[PDB]
Design an enzyme around this catalytic site. Structure first.
Site, PDB file in Angstrom:
ATOM      1  N   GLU A 133      16.796  71.326  86.408  1.00  0.00           N
ATOM      2  CA  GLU A 133      17.519  72.572  86.147  1.00  0.00           C
ATOM      3  C   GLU A 133      18.988  72.237  85.859  1.00  0.00           C
ATOM      4  O   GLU A 133      19.600  71.497  86.599  1.00  0.00           O
ATOM      5  CB  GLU A 133      17.471  73.385  87.443  1.00  0.00           C
ATOM      6  CG  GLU A 133      18.029  74.792  87.368  1.00  0.00           C
ATOM      7  CD  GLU A 133      18.282  75.382  88.758  1.00  0.00           C
ATOM      8  OE1 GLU A 133      18.009  74.721  89.814  1.00  0.00           O
ATOM      9  OE2 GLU A 133      18.811  76.511  88.793  1.00  0.00           O
TER      10      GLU A 133
ATOM     11  N   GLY B 297      28.292  62.677  82.818  1.00  0.00           N
ATOM     12  CA  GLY B 297      28.960  61.538  83.428  1.00  0.00           C
ATOM     13  C   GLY B 297      27.983  60.520  83.981  1.00  0.00           C
ATOM     14  O   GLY B 297      26.766  60.613  83.778  1.00  0.00           O
TER      15      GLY B 297
ATOM     16  N   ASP C 267      23.513  61.048 100.610  1.00  0.00           N
ATOM     17  CA  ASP C 267      24.735  60.843  99.829  1.00  0.00           C
ATOM     18  C   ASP C 267      25.379  62.155  99.341  1.00  0.00           C
ATOM     19  O   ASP C 267      25.802  62.254  98.152  1.00  0.00           O
ATOM     20  CB  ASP C 267      24.457  59.890  98.643  1.00  0.00           C
ATOM     21  CG  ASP C 267      25.732  59.413  97.959  1.00  0.00           C
ATOM     22  OD1 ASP C 267      26.776  59.242  98.672  1.00  0.00           O
ATOM     23  OD2 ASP C 267      25.788  59.170  96.711  1.00  0.00           O
TER      24      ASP C 267
ATOM     25  N   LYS D 193      18.404  62.800  83.546  1.00  0.00           N
ATOM     26  CA  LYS D 193      18.891  61.599  84.216  1.00  0.00           C
ATOM     27  C   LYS D 193      17.978  60.406  83.911  1.00  0.00           C
ATOM     28  O   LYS D 193      16.800  60.453  84.237  1.00  0.00           O
ATOM     29  CB  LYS D 193      18.977  61.850  85.728  1.00  0.00           C
ATOM     30  CG  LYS D 193      19.871  63.093  86.051  1.00  0.00           C
ATOM     31  CD  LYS D 193      20.128  63.314  87.546  1.00  0.00           C
ATOM     32  CE  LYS D 193      21.034  64.507  87.751  1.00  0.00           C
ATOM     33  NZ  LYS D 193      21.885  64.349  88.975  1.00  0.00           N
TER      34      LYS D 193
ATOM     35  N   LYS E  95      28.132  64.912  98.541  1.00  0.00           N
ATOM     36  CA  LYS E  95      29.495  64.764  98.032  1.00  0.00           C
ATOM     37  C   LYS E  95      29.758  65.896  97.070  1.00  0.00           C
ATOM     38  O   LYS E  95      28.813  66.399  96.470  1.00  0.00           O
ATOM     39  CB  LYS E  95      29.729  63.399  97.334  1.00  0.00           C
ATOM     40  CG  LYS E  95      29.007  63.102  96.007  1.00  0.00           C
ATOM     41  CD  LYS E  95      28.686  61.578  96.076  1.00  0.00           C
ATOM     42  CE  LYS E  95      28.152  61.008  94.797  1.00  0.00           C
ATOM     43  NZ  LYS E  95      27.876  59.556  95.060  1.00  0.00           N
ATOM     44  N   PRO E  96      31.023  66.306  96.932  1.00  0.00           N
ATOM     45  CA  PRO E  96      31.360  67.432  96.051  1.00  0.00           C
ATOM     46  C   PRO E  96      30.728  67.298  94.679  1.00  0.00           C
ATOM     47  O   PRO E  96      30.350  68.326  94.101  1.00  0.00           O
ATOM     48  CB  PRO E  96      32.872  67.359  95.974  1.00  0.00           C
ATOM     49  CG  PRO E  96      33.246  66.863  97.336  1.00  0.00           C
ATOM     50  CD  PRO E  96      32.224  65.749  97.588  1.00  0.00           C
TER      51      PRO E  96
ATOM     52  N   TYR F 297      22.477  56.504  89.730  1.00  0.00           N
ATOM     53  CA  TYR F 297      21.341  55.744  89.187  1.00  0.00           C
ATOM     54  C   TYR F 297      21.306  55.585  87.678  1.00  0.00           C
ATOM     55  O   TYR F 297      20.382  54.968  87.141  1.00  0.00           O
ATOM     56  CB  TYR F 297      20.012  56.352  89.625  1.00  0.00           C
ATOM     57  CG  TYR F 297      19.983  56.652  91.086  1.00  0.00           C
ATOM     58  CD1 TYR F 297      19.826  55.638  92.013  1.00  0.00           C
ATOM     59  CD2 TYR F 297      20.132  57.957  91.545  1.00  0.00           C
ATOM     60  CE1 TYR F 297      19.802  55.919  93.367  1.00  0.00           C
ATOM     61  CE2 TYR F 297      20.103  58.252  92.893  1.00  0.00           C
ATOM     62  CZ  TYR F 297      19.948  57.231  93.798  1.00  0.00           C
ATOM     63  OH  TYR F 297      19.944  57.505  95.140  1.00  0.00           O
TER      64      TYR F 297
HETATM   65  N1  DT5 Z   1      32.100  70.076  84.214  1.00  0.00           N
HETATM   66  S1  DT5 Z   1      31.636  69.628  85.660  1.00  0.00           S
HETATM   67  O1  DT5 Z   1      32.134  70.573  86.653  1.00  0.00           O
HETATM   68  O2  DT5 Z   1      32.155  68.286  85.949  1.00  0.00           O
HETATM   69  C1  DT5 Z   1      29.910  69.570  85.735  1.00  0.00           C
HETATM   70  C2  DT5 Z   1      29.285  69.080  86.890  1.00  0.00           C
HETATM   71  C3  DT5 Z   1      27.899  69.015  86.962  1.00  0.00           C
HETATM   72  C4  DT5 Z   1      27.127  69.418  85.869  1.00  0.00           C
HETATM   73  N2  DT5 Z   1      25.764  69.459  85.943  1.00  0.00           N
HETATM   74  C5  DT5 Z   1      24.965  68.531  86.632  1.00  0.00           C
HETATM   75  C6  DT5 Z   1      25.424  67.222  86.996  1.00  0.00           C
HETATM   76  C7  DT5 Z   1      24.518  66.376  87.687  1.00  0.00           C
HETATM   77  O3  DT5 Z   1      24.837  65.087  88.072  1.00  0.00           O
HETATM   78  C8  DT5 Z   1      26.168  64.776  87.978  1.00  0.00           C
HETATM   79  C9  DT5 Z   1      26.518  63.905  89.197  1.00  0.00           C
HETATM   80  C10 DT5 Z   1      27.959  63.392  89.110  1.00  0.00           C
HETATM   81  C11 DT5 Z   1      28.133  62.565  87.835  1.00  0.00           C
HETATM   82  C12 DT5 Z   1      27.826  63.445  86.621  1.00  0.00           C
HETATM   83  C13 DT5 Z   1      26.378  63.953  86.700  1.00  0.00           C
HETATM   84  N3  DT5 Z   1      23.259  66.818  87.932  1.00  0.00           N
HETATM   85  C14 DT5 Z   1      22.869  68.025  87.509  1.00  0.00           C
HETATM   86  N4  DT5 Z   1      21.699  68.630  87.693  1.00  0.00           N
HETATM   87  C15 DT5 Z   1      21.809  69.873  87.144  1.00  0.00           C
HETATM   88  N5  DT5 Z   1      23.060  69.977  86.624  1.00  0.00           N
HETATM   89  N6  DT5 Z   1      23.693  68.853  86.890  1.00  0.00           N
HETATM   90  C16 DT5 Z   1      27.764  69.946  84.728  1.00  0.00           C
HETATM   91  C17 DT5 Z   1      29.153  69.991  84.657  1.00  0.00           C
END
Ligand code: DT5
Length: 290
Positions: free
Chosen positions: A75, A11, A121, A33, A123-124, A15
């Site tokens: 990770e 998603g 920041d 990212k 947040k869930p 940034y």
């Molecule tokens: N399917 S999910 O529950 O929405 C989900 C959420 C998070 C992730 N993984 C994730 C997501 C993330 O950033 C998110 C922040 C909110 C927007 C999407 C990216 N940073 C991360 N660093 C390591 N894993 N990771 C994968 C799946």
């Protein structure tokens, strides 16, 4: 980028876009990212984050600064707390797992806070879970490195729900207390299965906080009335009972929550002190269903 094969869009982060990717040479599955932006100060700050390693902090694997572009490689974790709350809303996350999660997050905060690093920041969506019952903080330290904008590159409105009142009142300097506020908000939301303060503007956010905790004054928050965005004209609401706010939560949890939501950032409990609160006396580490 070319060292990595994109699997899927997780998603749109603060940034830039975040991808699940695979390292085409090591086999490593990672969160990639792209940072939308150069700046040498962001480079050295991000470099410091590489050393800030803790089991409840999403591990920063690599910084890639090539072709005048910035990628961060983390990770990978498969789920965030929002999805997991939504998935378990019929019954709520069980209290022993809420406690475990809160306990682990406070350990992560305590570690970063001891090194003078803030999140700003929480947040869930940036609290990430695995199958071993762990919960980890994502994007720690990034706000100081790059800022916190109103809207993302994709125009998604950044959420104010977990924003500490000193921020909303125009505090120019942030303390570690802002993360404790956010985490308290998240704690309450895990318990009640409702966001605590779902504001949709700054004033709506502030006035939601005020209506629940009482309009702050000089008694409870010395110096509040001289903060940048404080207005003498703010309505003066009275505080409500935590018994009415987070009902199912027991007396220990309510008492801890109260300390994490003190108006004065100087009075607000530290992550270290909160870890010693009687609420954690029977903490355990359950396996979540997932
Ligand atoms: N399917 S999910 O529950 O929405 C989900 C959420 C998070 C992730 N993984 C994730 C997501 C993330 O950033 C998110 C922040 C909110 C927007 C999407 C990216 N940073 C991360 N660093 C390591 N894993 N990771 C994968 C799946």
């Amino acid at each position: 980028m070319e060292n990595f094969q994109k699997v899927e869009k997780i998603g749109e982060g603060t940034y830039g876009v975040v991808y699940k990717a695979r390292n085409k040479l090591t086999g490593e599955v990672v969160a990639l990212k792209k940072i939308r932006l150069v700046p040498s100060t962001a480079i050295r700050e991000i470099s410091l984050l590489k050393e800030l390693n803790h089991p409840n902090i999403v591990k920063l694997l690599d910084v890639i600064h090539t072709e005048n572009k910035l990628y961060l490689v983390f990770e990978f974790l498969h789920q965030d707390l929002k999805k997991f709350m939504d998935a378990s809303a019929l019954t709520g996350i069980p209290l022993p797992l809420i406690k475990s999660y809160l306990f682990q997050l406070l350990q992560g905060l305590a570690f970063c806070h001891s090194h003078r690093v803030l999140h700003r920041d929480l947040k869930p969506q940036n609290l990430l879970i695995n199958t071993e019952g762990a919960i980890k903080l994502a994007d720690f330290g990034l706000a100081r490195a790059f800022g916190v904008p109103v809207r993302t590159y994709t125009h998604e409105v950044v959420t104010l729900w977990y924003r500490a009142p000193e921020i909303l009142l125009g505090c120019k300097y942030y303390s570690t207390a802002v993360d404790i506020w956010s985490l308290g908000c998240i704690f309450a939301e895990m318990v009640t299965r409702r966001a605590l303060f779902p504001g949709d503007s700054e004033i709506d956010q502030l006035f939601r906080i005020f209506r629940t905790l009482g309009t702050p004054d000089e008694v409870v928050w010395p110096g509040v009335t001289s903060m940048p965005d404080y207005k003498p004209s703010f309505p003066k609401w009275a505080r409500q009972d935590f018994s009415k706010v987070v009902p199912p939560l027991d007396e220990d949890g309510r008492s801890l929550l109260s300390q994490m939501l003190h108006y004065d950032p100087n009075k607000r409990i530290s992550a270290k002190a909160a870890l010693a609160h009687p609420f954690f006396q029977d903490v355990t580490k359950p396996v979540p269903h997932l």
